[PDB]
């Protein structure tokens, strides 16, 4: 009756050439055709890998880049801020 989606960080990084932070999320359950739906709405780079889906989303000062790890004083901040970012994002879209 209800679908269960789990999104977690798989590979995070930063591009000095651009000046923004990027991170890849791991999603399982989507389909070849379904991917075209999300990739369109998000307008990001989606690709099937071993059944999972890679999504890289980076934002500059304009949208506030992801780099507030100095707060938590560890990498956990990146995965924590990134995980909730995707989870909350989707949940917020489905809930609304």
XYZ file of N, CA and C in Angstrom:
288
model
N 0.828 -1.201 0.000
C 0.000 0.000 0.000
C 0.866 1.256 0.000
N 2.019 1.175 0.656
C 2.938 2.305 0.730
C 4.325 1.919 0.228
N 4.971 2.845 -0.474
C 6.304 2.602 -1.012
C 7.379 3.097 -0.047
N 8.508 2.398 -0.020
C 9.612 2.763 0.860
C 10.847 3.150 0.053
N 11.258 4.408 0.178
C 12.426 4.906 -0.537
C 13.536 5.294 0.434
N 14.752 4.841 0.147
C 15.901 5.143 0.992
C 17.024 5.777 0.178
N 17.383 7.007 0.531
C 18.446 7.723 -0.165
C 19.595 8.055 0.779
N 20.791 7.590 0.434
C 21.974 7.838 1.249
C 23.159 8.246 0.379
N 24.099 8.977 0.971
C 25.282 9.429 0.250
C 26.216 8.264 -0.059
N 26.761 8.254 -1.271
C 27.670 7.194 -1.690
C 29.060 7.755 -1.984
N 29.101 8.986 -2.481
C 30.365 9.637 -2.805
C 30.200 11.153 -2.847
N 30.892 11.843 -1.945
C 30.820 13.298 -1.878
C 32.144 13.928 -2.301
N 32.069 15.138 -2.847
C 33.266 15.830 -3.287
C 33.030 17.309 -3.518
N 34.096 18.034 -3.840
C 34.000 19.468 -4.085
C 34.814 19.866 -5.313
N 34.252 20.755 -6.125
C 34.924 21.217 -7.333
C 35.411 22.654 -7.169
N 36.728 22.824 -7.103
C 37.320 24.146 -6.945
C 37.168 24.967 -8.223
N 37.066 24.277 -9.353
C 36.916 24.941 -10.643
C 35.587 25.688 -10.718
N 34.607 25.219 -9.952
C 33.290 25.844 -9.932
C 33.087 26.646 -8.651
N 33.443 26.048 -7.518
C 33.293 26.722 -6.243
C 32.087 26.233 -5.467
N 31.615 25.037 -5.802
C 30.457 24.455 -5.131
C 30.726 23.005 -4.740
N 29.940 22.497 -3.798
C 30.091 21.122 -3.335
C 29.091 20.202 -4.027
N 29.498 18.958 -4.256
C 28.637 17.980 -4.911
C 28.647 16.655 -4.157
N 27.561 15.899 -4.288
C 27.443 14.609 -3.621
C 26.550 13.660 -4.413
N 26.908 12.379 -4.412
C 26.139 11.371 -5.132
C 25.284 10.551 -4.170
N 24.011 10.386 -4.513
C 23.087 9.626 -3.679
C 22.810 8.254 -4.285
N 22.551 7.275 -3.423
C 22.271 5.916 -3.871
C 20.797 5.572 -3.673
N 20.082 5.396 -4.780
C 18.663 5.062 -4.728
C 18.379 3.757 -5.463
N 17.627 2.872 -4.815
C 17.284 1.583 -5.405
C 15.771 1.392 -5.449
N 15.274 0.912 -6.585
C 13.847 0.691 -6.736
C 13.291 1.329 -7.994
N 13.951 2.382 -8.463
C 13.516 3.085 -9.665
C 13.622 2.183 -10.890
N 13.124 2.672 -12.022
C 13.167 1.912 -13.266
C 13.834 2.720 -14.374
N 14.191 2.043 -15.461
C 14.840 2.698 -16.590
C 14.004 3.874 -17.090
N 12.700 3.653 -17.214
C 11.792 4.694 -17.684
C 11.512 5.710 -16.581
N 11.310 5.214 -15.366
C 11.032 6.078 -14.223
C 12.152 7.096 -14.025
N 13.388 6.656 -14.235
C 14.546 7.528 -14.081
C 14.383 8.807 -14.894
N 13.850 8.670 -16.103
C 13.641 9.816 -16.980
C 12.710 10.836 -16.330
N 11.848 10.357 -15.439
C 10.903 11.224 -14.745
C 11.619 12.096 -13.718
N 12.370 11.457 -12.828
C 13.108 12.175 -11.794
C 14.194 13.053 -12.409
N 14.989 12.466 -13.297
C 16.063 13.196 -13.960
C 15.536 14.458 -14.632
N 14.270 14.422 -15.038
C 13.645 15.564 -15.695
C 13.254 16.631 -14.676
N 12.605 16.202 -13.599
C 12.174 17.118 -12.552
C 13.375 17.739 -11.843
N 14.350 16.905 -11.503
C 15.552 17.371 -10.820
C 16.531 17.997 -11.809
N 16.484 17.535 -13.053
C 17.363 18.052 -14.095
C 18.824 17.758 -13.768
N 19.055 16.669 -13.042
C 20.407 16.278 -12.661
C 20.902 15.120 -13.522
N 22.059 14.574 -13.162
C 22.642 13.460 -13.900
C 22.303 12.130 -13.235
N 21.365 11.398 -13.830
C 20.948 10.109 -13.294
C 21.430 8.965 -14.178
N 21.837 7.867 -13.548
C 22.321 6.702 -14.280
C 22.165 5.434 -13.447
N 21.822 4.335 -14.112
C 21.640 3.057 -13.433
C 22.981 2.367 -13.204
N 23.219 1.944 -11.968
C 24.463 1.269 -11.616
C 24.205 0.134 -10.630
N 24.262 -1.098 -11.125
C 24.034 -2.270 -10.288
C 22.646 -2.227 -9.658
N 21.727 -1.522 -10.311
C 20.373 -1.413 -9.800
C 20.127 -0.101 -9.085
N 21.197 0.514 -8.592
C 21.092 1.783 -7.882
C 21.136 2.956 -8.857
N 20.844 4.149 -8.351
C 20.850 5.351 -9.178
C 21.747 6.426 -8.570
N 22.600 7.015 -9.401
C 23.511 8.059 -8.946
C 22.973 9.443 -9.291
N 22.878 10.303 -8.282
C 22.382 11.660 -8.478
C 23.332 12.686 -7.868
N 23.915 13.524 -8.719
C 24.843 14.552 -8.265
C 24.206 15.936 -8.332
N 24.111 16.595 -7.182
C 23.524 17.928 -7.111
C 24.438 18.891 -6.363
N 24.910 19.917 -7.064
C 25.794 20.910 -6.467
C 25.173 22.303 -6.536
N 25.434 23.111 -5.514
C 24.899 24.466 -5.456
C 25.948 25.443 -4.935
N 26.005 26.622 -5.547
C 26.963 27.645 -5.145
C 26.351 28.587 -4.112
N 27.107 29.614 -3.736
C 26.642 30.587 -2.755
C 25.200 30.998 -3.039
N 24.864 31.113 -4.320
C 23.518 31.501 -4.724
C 22.470 30.646 -4.017
N 22.774 29.363 -3.854
C 21.857 28.439 -3.196
C 22.488 27.850 -1.938
N 23.592 28.447 -1.501
C 24.292 27.982 -0.310
C 24.863 26.584 -0.526
N 26.180 26.515 -0.774
C 26.876 25.245 -1.003
C 26.970 24.400 0.263
N 27.084 23.088 0.085
C 27.182 22.169 1.214
C 28.621 22.076 1.715
N 28.899 22.757 2.823
C 30.236 22.741 3.388
C 30.272 23.267 4.809
N 29.209 23.002 5.563
C 29.121 23.459 6.945
C 29.557 22.360 7.909
N 30.502 21.535 7.468
C 31.007 20.442 8.291
C 31.759 20.978 9.505
N 32.262 22.203 9.390
C 33.005 22.829 10.477
C 32.174 22.858 11.757
N 30.853 22.827 11.599
C 29.947 22.854 12.740
C 30.047 21.562 13.545
N 29.792 20.439 12.883
C 29.854 19.136 13.533
C 31.300 18.729 13.800
N 32.223 19.317 13.048
C 33.642 19.018 13.205
C 33.948 17.579 12.802
N 33.408 17.162 11.663
C 33.623 15.810 11.163
C 32.896 15.595 9.840
N 33.200 14.486 9.175
C 32.571 14.163 7.899
C 31.101 13.811 8.092
N 30.762 13.332 9.284
C 29.388 12.958 9.596
C 28.419 14.078 9.232
N 28.898 15.315 9.303
C 28.073 16.473 8.979
C 27.657 16.452 7.512
N 28.585 16.062 6.644
C 28.314 16.000 5.212
C 27.250 14.950 4.905
N 27.462 13.738 5.406
C 26.520 12.646 5.186
C 25.197 12.911 5.896
N 25.272 13.554 7.056
C 24.080 13.871 7.832
C 23.264 14.971 7.162
N 23.948 16.017 6.708
C 23.287 17.135 6.049
C 22.810 16.740 4.655
N 23.552 15.842 4.013
C 23.205 15.381 2.674
C 22.043 14.393 2.723
N 22.114 13.450 3.657
C 21.069 12.444 3.807
C 19.714 13.101 4.054
N 19.659 13.976 5.051
C 18.423 14.673 5.388
C 17.978 15.585 4.250
N 18.946 16.107 3.505
C 18.653 16.995 2.385
C 17.810 16.281 1.332
N 18.226 15.071 0.971
C 17.509 14.284 -0.026
C 16.227 13.700 0.561
N 16.338 13.117 1.749
C 15.188 12.521 2.419
C 14.080 13.550 2.615
N 14.434 14.692 3.197
C 13.470 15.758 3.441
C 12.920 16.312 2.131
N 13.793 16.444 1.138
C 13.395 16.962 -0.165
C 12.285 16.109 -0.773
N 12.548 14.814 -0.904
C 11.574 13.889 -1.471
C 10.316 13.827 -0.610
N 10.498 13.544 0.676
C 9.378 13.454 1.606
C 8.503 14.701 1.523
N 9.142 15.857 1.372
C 8.424 17.122 1.285
C 7.627 17.206 -0.014
N 8.151 16.578 -1.063
C 7.490 16.580 -2.362
C 6.311 15.613 -2.382
N 6.484 14.467 -1.733
C 5.434 13.456 -1.674
C 4.363 13.841 -0.658
N 4.792 14.444 0.445
C 3.868 14.865 1.493
C 3.034 16.059 1.037
N 3.589 16.843 0.119
C 2.898 18.017 -0.402
C 2.579 17.846 -1.885
